[PDB]
Amino acid sequence: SLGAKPFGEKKFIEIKGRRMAYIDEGTGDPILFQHGNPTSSYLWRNIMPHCAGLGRLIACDLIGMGDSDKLDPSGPERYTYAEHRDYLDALWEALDLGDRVVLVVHDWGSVLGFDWARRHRERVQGIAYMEAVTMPLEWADFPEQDRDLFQAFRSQAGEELVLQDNVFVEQVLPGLILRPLSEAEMAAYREPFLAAGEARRPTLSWPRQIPIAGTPADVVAIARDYAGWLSESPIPKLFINAEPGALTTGRIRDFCRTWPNQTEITVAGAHFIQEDSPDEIGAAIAAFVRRLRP
Ligand SMILES: [Ca+2]
Ligand SMILES: [Cl-]
Ligand SMILES: [Cl-]
């Protein structure tokens, strides 16, 4: 069902001298849910219950997000993809995930997750993905309505929009969900970002890291790498397509639809489709996992 209640209890672990928060419920092989910008583990709260008893249900808060510590000192050079990956790699190592992991990814969680999967292919039992960066992007991949704003994030105007005015949390997020969010839902999304300034840095550093039109070169290469790999990997995949969708449409959906050993369903949603179709998404992931774990 829907609802504003978080799933399970937030746990904390020290990683590289910082505290990171995560959900870890149940026993067995992990089903690892990874949020992106500007969300947290909370994004998965109505989806994870569908996987009850099918494995160890894990959802991590990226550094500087959710209940994870902020980086100190924060600035325009902090919260790059490389920095997030260092923290997330270390967190996933510390969680003792074993060698039959199911990944469930979205947004930046998909860049992180696809990259991790490429680097740890022997430990990956299945990949479920939605509204994901399937390959390096181009401006024409962005819906016409969102293109200008993301361009503005990647300019000097970004600090005012995001650090001062919290545009990613307050405008982009609700603007890419079809149903109206409740007071409690927006309160949960707002919470890590209540204060103006550096507290909000992760939500600006992220759009500045998106691999678009060849920049930044490091993230482009990482996505080119996992794009080639995923297009050839026989690892079972679940592609949750969205209507109207937002990111994973047109060219980049044409591309991910070439990936082998892949099941597809379509659900209602724009970008943050977890808020529109959590039961359809959860049911599909649960069925995928059941087939992977007979
Ligand atoms: Ca909306
Ligand atoms: Cl095992
Ligand atoms: Cl972003």
3-state SS of the chain is CCCCCCCCCCEEEEECCEEEEEEEECCCCEEEEECCCCCCHHHHCCCHHHHCCCCEEEEECCCCCCCCCCCCCCCCCCCCHHHHHHHHHHHHHHCCCCCCEEEEEEEHHHHHHHHHHHHCHHHEEEEEEEEECCCCECHHHCCHHHHHHHHHHCCCCHHHHHHHCCHHHHHHHHHCCCCCCCHHHHHHHHHHHCCCCHHHHHHHHCHHHCCECCECHHHHHHHHHHHHHHCCCCCCEEEEEEEECCCCCHHHHHHHCCCCCEEEEEEEECCCHHHCCHHHHHHHHHHHHHHHCC
Q: Under a CB-based contact definition with an 8 Å cutoff, are residues 279 and 267 in contact?
A: no
Q: How many domains does the chain have?
A: 1
Q: Under a CB-based contact definition with an 8 Å cutoff, are residues 116 and 123 in contact?
A: no
Residue found by looking up tokens 């892949």 in the block: 262
Question: Could you tell me the residue range of the domain that residue 104 belongs to?
Answer: 1-294
Q: Of the listed 61, 131, 141, 185, which one is catalytic?
A: 131
Angle at which helices 81-94 and 108-119 cross, to 10°: 60
Tell me the two tokens of residue 173. Answer: 């997020």
Q: Under a CB-based contact definition with an 8 Å cutoff, are residues 177 and 270 in contact?
A: yes
CATH code assigned at 112: 3.40.50.1820
Residues annotated in a binding site for Ca(2+): 174, 177
Resolution (A): 1.8
Alpha-carbon distance of 144 to 165, in angstroms, equals 23
Q: Under a CB-based contact definition with an 8 Å cutoff, are residues 223 and 133 in contact?
A: yes
Active site residue 77: no
Active site residue 131: yes
Torsion of CA 183, 5, 201, 129, to 10 degrees: -120
Distance from residue 10's CA to the centre of ligand 2 (Å): 25
The answer, yes or no, to whether the previous bond of 260 is cis (omega within 30 of 0) is: no
Alpha-carbon distance of 243 to 36, in angstroms, equals 20
Strand partners, 132: 107
Which protein residues have their CB within 5 A of the ion that is ligand 3? Answer: 37, 206-207
Cα-only R_g, the chain: 17
Tell me the two tokens of residue 233. Answer: 């990997």
Instruction: Name the residue among 83, 41, 90, 44 with its Cα closest to residue 65.
Output: 41
Experimental method for this entry?
X-ray
Residues annotated in a binding site: 174, 177
Q: How many CB atoms within 10 Å of residue 142?
A: 19
Burial of 119 from C-beta contacts in 10 A (0-12 / 13-18 / 19+): middle
Active site residue 50: no
Distance from residue 277's CA to the centre of ligand 3 (Å): 21
Of the listed ligands, the closest to the CA of 56 is 2
